[PDB]
């Protein structure tokens, strides 16, 4: 409810949006966070520390308290509870999912998205000016930037996830392309009567991290391949699968988890469904990011009807959380 | 209010912050505005006339709606008020504003704050690989699109601050630095009773647009240089002018300004003054971009104090508009 010269302003805001995340970035990257454990401190104290310098980072703070991050009073910045996290003694620091979310690859592919519009649909190589291996065989410490952010950022949605998921009290889990086991670990953590078993590829569940002592007796891994085929489970979890997969493969990727599943059976799509409407949610945030990667697409509950369809599975009901993940429920039809 | 691991999450969240300005980009890159204008429409109508990928459009416009500048119902889209200002049609076009702000050197810059938090303060060159003139003519059409976003940047705010500020209704206007002439010209149209000085560098003047019939005879222009002296006025103007220079040119400048004024004159300093506190507020981000572009700070009202009474003035007030921009209104003290 505007006239057209407000609106030009309040586009020209809306273009700055930006500064926000470059901001995180930069603080995350400096580690500011740490020096605020013992309580307000000055942009002087903290430029020591850091250590930058106290007019310039002062700036990036003050645009930070914005969104809540820290908080100024008296000349003196605070870390809030919603900055908690930038503290490297957190159970899961901020800080890696942070730099990745706003890595190089990410802000340049996001910043191109107009030439990634393109009417037959152009790929990554197109857009970036390399391939992502080559991105990633050109730097080391980019690539295992990444492996920590994801593993990190999955790590922050497990507990609420597994109260949240409809688990049996006894039964085996599957969870299907489940990584180095997080998931699963903490599932089993949550219901100590469920058996688990971890696929994923080979290289990966080498590195697995599901051999803790009290969960000892109740969890084994397994070498292979969603595409052909999964193990038998009276619980399937497909976690950040789907929204990876073209729509072919999703159904062939449930059709497999269909064959192997019991009458009493389910399989959990788990992935950061769309919300129709025009309201702010995460999932369409991400949407966009791997629209700009070239690589991926989140979906809606109406449009992951079809696929159950089509793998002999019902949708039954979609499941909100207090993350942004929700749990799509599909039994056997 | 909440803990560690929402924290994360939260964190997560703001660091994709930097999508919506993206997607602001590049809904104003292919121009899906102006197939708007005849009412909602689908995105496989709108990918025809723009002509791009429907599904992928659609994503786009989808993360647009969260910010209202479209908004979607029965698979349709429409321009809303706010996103008003992206037609062609418009007196102030927003697109050039909008390619200019989320350009390839602002994104980059602000990329690499992080580098710019040095505690020397590294230069332009050393962050971006190249000097920003190297930049400019190294791609023609970039160096046009700056000009243009900066010309209709201020277009858009020239009437309220036309009318926001204290004219006298006959006297003389230096608008020290003023462009092309845009601001000074509004000016006039908005207190008949006034003359008008335009004073820019040489290469601007020459390109003025104060040659209007509408206020023929009203108005001279002069090349100069602020730094050295500023002609005699009863009103001296300097908007966007202090926030390009360090502490002791503004003083200088200000200075000039006061030695050529009158008893009953008065100078205006014109910024985006950046309020103290915590609350969201354009001048801030404004602020961090010229923090990335390591060239310019936007001040506080108590910063800009100290510069006043150093040229012989005296802060007298500040005066807020419906714009990001304020009137720091200095008389000789
Ligand atoms: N063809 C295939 N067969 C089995 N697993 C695959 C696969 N292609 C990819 N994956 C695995 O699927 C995972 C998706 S990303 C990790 C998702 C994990 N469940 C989590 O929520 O954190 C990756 O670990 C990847 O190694
Ligand atoms: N030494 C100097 N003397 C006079 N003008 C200068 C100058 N250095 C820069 N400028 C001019 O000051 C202006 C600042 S940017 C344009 C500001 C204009 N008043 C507006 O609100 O849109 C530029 O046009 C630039 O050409």
Redesign the pocket.
């Known amino acids: 409810d505007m006239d057209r010269l407000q609106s030009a302003l309040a586009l020209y805001e809306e273009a700055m949006g930006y500064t926000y995340a470059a901001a995180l970035r930069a603080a995350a990257a400096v580690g500011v966070a740490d020096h605020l454990v013992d309580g307000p401190r000055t942009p002087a104290e903290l430029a020591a520390a850091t250590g930058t310098d106290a007019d310039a980072l002062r700036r990036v703070l003050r645009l930070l308290a914005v969104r809540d991050v820290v908080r100024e009073s008296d000349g003196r910045f605070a870390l809030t509870d919603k900055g908690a996290a930038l503290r490297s003694d957190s159970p899961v620091p901020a800080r890696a999912g942070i730099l990745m979310f706003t890595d190089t690859m990410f802000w340049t592919m996001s910043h191109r998205v107009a030439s990634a519009l393109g009417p037959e649909r152009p790929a990554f190589a197109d857009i970036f000016g390399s391939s992502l291996d080559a991105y990633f065989d050109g730097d080391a410490e980019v690539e295992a930037l990444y492996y920590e952010g994801?593993?990190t950022v999955?790590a922050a949605e497990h507990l609420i996830l597994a109260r949240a998921g409809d688990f049996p009290a006894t039964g085996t889990v599957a969870?299907?392309?489940?990584?180095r086991g997080?998931?699963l670990l903490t599932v089993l953590r949550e219901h100590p009567g469920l058996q688990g078993v971890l696929?994923?590829?080979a290289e990966?569940v080498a590195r697995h991290r599901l051999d803790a002592p009290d969960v000892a007796g109740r969890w084994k891994v397994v070498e292979?391949?969603?595409?052909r085929e999964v193990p038998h489970a009276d619980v399937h979890v497909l976690?950040?699968?789907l929204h990876?997969w073209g729509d072919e493969d999703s159904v062939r990727i449930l059709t497999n988890c269909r064959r192997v599943m019991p009458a009493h059976g389910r399989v959990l799509v788990?992935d950061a469904v769309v919300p129709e409407g025009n309201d702010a949610h995460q999932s369409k945030e991400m949407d966009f990011m791997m629209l700009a990667a070239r690589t991926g697409q989140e979906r809606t509950a109406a449009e992951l009807e079809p696929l159950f369809t089509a793998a002999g599975l019902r949708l039954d009901r979609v499941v909100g959380t207090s993350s942004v993940m929700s749990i799509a429920v599909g039994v056997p039809a």
């Open positions: 994801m593993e999955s969870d299907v392309g489940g990584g997080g998931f696929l994923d590829r990966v292979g391949d969603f595409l976690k950040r699968i990876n788990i």
